[PDB]
Design a protein around this ligand. Sequence first.
Ligand code: U1H
Length: 330
Amino acid sequence: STGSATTTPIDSLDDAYITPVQIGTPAQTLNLDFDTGSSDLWVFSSETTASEVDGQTIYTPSKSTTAKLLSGATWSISYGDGSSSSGDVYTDTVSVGGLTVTGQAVESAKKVSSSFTEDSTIDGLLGLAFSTLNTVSPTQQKTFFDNAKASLDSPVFTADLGYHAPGTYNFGFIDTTAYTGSITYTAVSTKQGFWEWTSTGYAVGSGTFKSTSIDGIADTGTTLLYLPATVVSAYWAQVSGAKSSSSVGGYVFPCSATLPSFTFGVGSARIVIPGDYIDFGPISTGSSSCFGGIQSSAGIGINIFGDVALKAAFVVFNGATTPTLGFASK
Ligand SMILES: NCc1ccc(C(F)(F)F)cc1
């Protein structure tokens, strides 16, 4: 079997992407943030503290004839940006783009942090990292991908994120019309539960490519590109007037500047991020200082190839017994 679903940026900056997901019987459609950096499927629900809900579509388990309460199970997650949520757990039928899994753990939020409340366009997250990171206690639960794997034509999913435009998540097949040239595959380490891989280096603009190993994760749930301080300094040094601002919390640049492209290595292949992708617009309404899409990972502790990088490529998440990541230009 296969599935295919359109994913859409939530705003004009591509801060995040939402994908419609059908939950329950009859279907309740929620728009979820597909996150290859976490492993919980959680949703706003009828159980969420009413004051913490501000426009989200809620899942109502009592209206689903296939919903079952998972007795005594709870969940609690904290994300790298300080966001968090927690609640209880149902199992229910979940379908993405025609691909249906029965008995999927659907984590119902009782409490959400304010950053989720204020994001009225995101109804929940669908985690696509490895199941070892799932937070359900006392019995850990499997991701949607893990539950679907045996039914898929091929144990893969692909991310084709658009720049200021819709894109596609496909499950179970590789659309050979969606990319150019060939797919370069690279090894994945699952030791921390992430889609973790090693980039072979980088270049700024038309500068010389620097061969150097950058260990990082492929994370559709993170907006920006977080790289070592040395690399980020080399990039922003080429932007007249750019500087690191403590009050803003990262590199900012004069909005009138043209940004250079950023190249990262996948084995011997090169993926080029156009400079326009790195512009995240004015830091506040009306400001002539703009926020940069490449930032230092020094405070984060891990390098993150977020949407800025992934949307420049066609990305294959190969969940074979030895997992790999594939990148192609598009
Ligand atoms: N990386 C997971 C994640 C995704 C979205 C959000 C936000 F922005 F919706 F709060 C927080 C954390």
